[PDB]
């Protein structure tokens, strides 16, 4: 049907240039304004500007005017958005949307069609495997017959990393938490498993961490505290 | 270039009528449109020209206006209604330079609509001290995992020996669990020395008024 398909997401470093795209299909591309909206993680929708594909007339948000450039290629029904110099503050998901003209008694406009968005991460980080540290169980991690032990998967980039326990033999009570993107740009993650305290002295616990992006596989035996 | 203000949060029970306000100084002579967005998805047009809803939008969604305020009223709030809501308008400024007119698209910061679908559930906390392996690597990290809390929202605070400290803290946002409850985690970085030369550190989790905490100390 009618839709807008945006280019794939990317990860760039400060200072680099960038050009993302948006291909429409199913309607006359040249007849409806194309707007661009940014959405930094957690934050709300920010307006970047609008451009009319037939003559490329454009309106930019005072915040972006001169920092980014809107443009379209009529021959292929595609709107673009470019930077010559990226900054960390440019990180976010960029949406491409078409402004629809509702004609009637009194006409109006609203953004009815939207692209799926292009995630853009501007960072100094580089692909790395993580260091894995054991989170030993203790009298501090022992509740009502249950002990909590885990693994700390630190400083990796980018996503994702998987974690299992005892080669997939241990699943019950396993809770792998979503990672944190540190101010350093690297990710850190934690996986914890609650097991019977009675078993601490006889059962072996190993977390299997896999970071495909860097071909890093590591198994970590987690033994009872001190 | 004027602001659009809307409550960052609105909560309601299934079946109840939810109300999302939005005000700006020029809304008295500007059309307002409303969009919906499920986390990780693309915006969806719900209302335009104040009260006209696109074909395919539930009649339960009504768009209203009054003075410098626009309102999106959701009667019989189901649960697919859960998500973020943004209002938007425009502004025009015919430059004094003879010719040239600037148009502006404005968005409210958005409203997170919450449909209370299950009882309030306090968070379970677990704080892990730095391991010996990291400490020897000349680094130290305190891990505070938090789970099974509803609704999904918590504020973390770290007090080393009953005294706060905002430095070295990195907390995640809440995330839905496989059982429909939410989870989040916070980390505190220190140096091997900075940690061994104290009596203890604590992770304090505040959820729905009531707050819980955990503590750890060096060997």
């Amino acid at each position: 049907e009618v839709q807008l398909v945006e280019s794939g997401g990317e990860v760039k470093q400060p200072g680099q240039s960038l050009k993302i795209s948006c291909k429409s299909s199913g309607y006359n591309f040249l007849d409806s304004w194309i707007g661009w909206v940014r959405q930094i993680p957690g934050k709300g929708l920010e307006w970047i500007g609008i451009i009319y594909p037939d003559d490329s007339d454009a309106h930019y948000s005072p915040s972006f005017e001169g920092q980014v450039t809107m443009s379209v290629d009529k021959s292929i029904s595609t709107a673009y958005l470019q930077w010559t110099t990226l900054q960390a503050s440019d990180t976010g998901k960029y949406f491409c949307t078409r402004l629809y003209l509702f004609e009637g008694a009194q006409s109006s406009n609203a953004f009815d069609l939207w692209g799926q968005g292009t995630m853009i991460l501007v960072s100094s980080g580089t692909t790395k495997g993580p260091s894995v540290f054991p989170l030993a169980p203790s009298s501090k991690s022992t509740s009502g017959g249950t002990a909590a032990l885990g693994c700390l998967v630190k400083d990796y980039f980018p996503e994702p990393v998987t974690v299992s326990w005892n080669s997939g033999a241990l699943t019950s009570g396993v809770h792998t938490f979503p990672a944190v993107l540190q101010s350093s740009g690297l990710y850190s993650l934690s996986s914890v498993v609650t097991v019977p305290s009675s078993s601490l002295g006889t059962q072996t616990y190993i977390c299997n961490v896999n970071h495909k992006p860097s071909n890093t596989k590591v198994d970590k035996k987690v033994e009872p505290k001190s | 270039s004027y602001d659009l203000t809307q409550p960052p949060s609105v909560s309601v029970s299934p079946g109840q009528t939810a109300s999302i306000s939005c005000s700006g100084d020029k809304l008295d002579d500007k059309y307002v449109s409303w969009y919906y967005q499920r986390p990780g998805q693309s915006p969806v047009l719900l209302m335009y020209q104040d009260f006209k809803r696109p074909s395919g939008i539930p009649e339960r969604l009504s768009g209203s206006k009054s003075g410098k305020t626009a309102t999106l009223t959701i009667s019989g709030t189901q649960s697919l209604d859960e998500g973020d809501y943004y209002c938007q308008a425009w502004d025009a400024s015919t430059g004094v330079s003879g010719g040239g007119t600037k148009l502006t698209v404005l968005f409210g910061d958005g409203t997170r609509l919450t449909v209370l679908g299950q009882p309030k559930a306090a968070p379970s906390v677990t704080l892990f001290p730095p391991s010996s392996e990291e400490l020897q690597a000349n680094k130290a990290t305190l891990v505070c995992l938090i789970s099974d809390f509803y609704p999904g929202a918590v504020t973390v605070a770290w007090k080393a020996d009953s005294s706060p400290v905002k430095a070295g803290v990195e907390t995640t946002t809440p995330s839905k669990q496989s059982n429909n409850k939410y989870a989040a985690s916070s980390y505190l970085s220190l140096t091997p020395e900075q940690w061994k030369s104290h009596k203890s550190y604590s992770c304090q989790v505040t959820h729905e008024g009531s707050t819980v905490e955990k503590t750890v100390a060096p060997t």
Partner: peptide
């Protein structure tokens, strides 16, 4: 005085609000 823009182009028009 309305709040229409690019009116002379029935397809490029953007209506900001109620006229007058």
């Amino acid at each position: 005085a309305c709040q229409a823009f690019y009116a002379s182009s029935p397809r490029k028009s953007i209506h900001i609000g109620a006229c007058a």
